[PDB]
Design a binder for this molecule. Structure first.
Ligand SMILES: CC(C)(C)c1ccc(CNc2nc3[nH]c(CN4CCOCC4)cc(=O)n3n2)cc1
Lengths: 323, 342
């Protein structure tokens, strides 16, 4: 799958297995002993069994089935909801430690910024991808971590960070709405649909209210527009294009995250905004949308940054905590 | 709805102010020598019915006197329907336009300074408290500065530092249009009032992830019941179109309409609350007015907005509601026309 070459510390002679257990996804970071390979894997949390089965498989294939030489470090919120369930599922384990979620995210991000080349990049449709040589000025920054929800962290110094804000309108909202509305079963089908979509069929644009014309005034604002009469089936029967709905709600959720990230950056006098989590997925349209929102509100005085291992910030911090 | 106010009838021109929004037209007029301000709202979807209302107002309240009627149009829609108004009212004294933001702030400032029992606070703990803004009790410079969060299809946010000193700040495309569009399509709710009834009896916990569901307990600075991901529980042929019918058939009753209505009402309300808070923080404003057609005196919506402002500001900022929230723009237009007929 996804690997980085990095000279890990194997002084403890231990197979370190870091797990970020979110509401919806589990992310693992691990290194076969003496491999000098960081390995990354993502699965869904619902069906907690099918995941615990993943942790067994990693231990079987990558540490010769040796539980006694395996240490699990649990991060995210399942780290508490599931600390005991892990001991119950892995009785011969050498140990299970925890690493607080926000501290995991920042240690992971600081590691990727300072240590790993070709990891930090800008993206817009104009310029395309520019790699930022951060591992070759950095502080202060915001991390906007987009998962089910949105966590926003302020980082002033290497070990000084706080959670300044958040939103319940994250990836979970986008995935949930588009799944229920369109029947799409994969985030990739939602993304492929959004790519060919025209949001103008479901959104009220500035031009639609008045007569920038393509600016959205109201996301999904065009949609709403005893028995004695005909059945109100003309309403129930009104139809909307799946690609158009996907583009509308991708813009709505992405622009909103962008605006909140810009406002928090404004309050905190921060120029550098990192997007983390499992939301952009390297999708050019999502990245362009988040980059443009930061560019638009700041008139280019602030910068959106993306991460090749955006999903693995927490697990990476947790892995490094093992020593 | 009507208010007692000793109007200046000047040359007796009958001033019919219309705020034309995305979905709604909000009308303010005063029959000559009535000393009554009168208020009506109508959808703009059916042009015949909107134009019929204006005709009925002129017939019943100005004795059918078209030649002494002035229509002043405001809202984003003032431009788009100017020609519809010209073709429907060829006999009238005149049609003018008033700028949207000036209309909103002239209207709100009039309500704040002149009309009693207009401005109130609401939360579920304290109930409604009337703020005596027009009295002299809440007088001078406990009024300014303030934010107006004008919620219609979208959200407009205006800052007012002092009389005649106002500007637009960043708003949101996640407004009433978003809530109404999503719930109408997903749930088949027929009216905004049905969506709010369904929301009142709903349980959002069945479609939302709470902090409790993720962290198994309290956590940073959030209770277990706090919402972590709106609709976050829901995601767990080459077809082109979706309809309510297709969503209802495909999903049967896997998710309950009331629970969906409560989830998206909280999601959109909490989001507007946060953006209002963040703009008030940047501009060092304590006073946040909610206007437009969104709250509609709905106790849960008002509790949601007030709690969000109170939570983010740790009590330093306050949400204010308006008995005539829908009419701010139409009221400002009316006051301009009234000064012209003086
Ligand atoms: C980490 C996990 C559990 C996964 C998580 C992830 C995302 C969300 C998103 N939801 C959300 N986030 C916030 N943040 C704030 C900010 N406050 C600052 C002062 O201290 C108190 C909090 C207020 C608020 O209402 N929400 N709602 C919640 C929880």
């Amino acid at each position: 799958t996804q690997e980085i070459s990095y000279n890990c510390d194997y002084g403890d002679n231990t197979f370190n297995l870091a797990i970020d257990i979110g509401g919806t996804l589990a992310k693992v970071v691990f290194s076969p002993i003496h491999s000098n390979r960081l390995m990354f894997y993502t699965i869904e949390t619902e069906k907690i069994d099918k995941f615990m089965e993943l942790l067994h498989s990693i231990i079987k294939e990558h540490n010769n089935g040796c539980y006694r030489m395996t240490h699990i470090i649990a991060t995210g919120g399942g780290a508490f909801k599931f600390y005991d369930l892990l001991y119950e599922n892995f009785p011969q384990i050498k140990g299970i430690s925890r690493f607080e979620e926000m501290e995991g995210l920042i240690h992971g991000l600081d590691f990727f910024i300072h240590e790993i080349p070709d990891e930090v990049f800008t993206y817009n449709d104009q310029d395309g991808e520019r790699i930022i040589p951060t591992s070759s000025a950095i502080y202060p920054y915001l991390l906007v971590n987009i998962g089910s929800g949105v966590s926003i962290l302020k980082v002033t110094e290497p070990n000084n960070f706080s959670r300044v804000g958040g939103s319940s309108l994250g990836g979970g909202t986008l995935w949930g709405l588009l799944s229920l509305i369109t029947g799409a079963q994969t985030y990739d089908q939602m993304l492929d649909w959004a790519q060919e979509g025209d949001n103008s069929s479901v959104d009220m644009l500035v031009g639609d209210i008045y007569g920038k014309s393509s600016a959205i005034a109201s996301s999904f604002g065009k949609v709403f527009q005893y028995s004695s009469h005909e059945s109100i089936e003309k309403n129930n029967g009104q139809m909307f294009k799946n690609p158009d709905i996907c583009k509308s709600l991708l813009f709505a959720i992405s622009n909103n995250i962008g605006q909140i990230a810009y406002l928090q950056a404004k309050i905190n006098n921060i120029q550098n905004i990192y997007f983390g989590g499992s939301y952009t997925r390297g999708h050019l349209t999502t990245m362009n949308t988040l980059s443009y929102a930061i560019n638009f509100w700041s008139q280019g005085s602030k910068q959106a940054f993306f991460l090749k291992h955006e999903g693995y910030l927490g697990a990476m911090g947790a892995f490094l905590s093992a020593s």
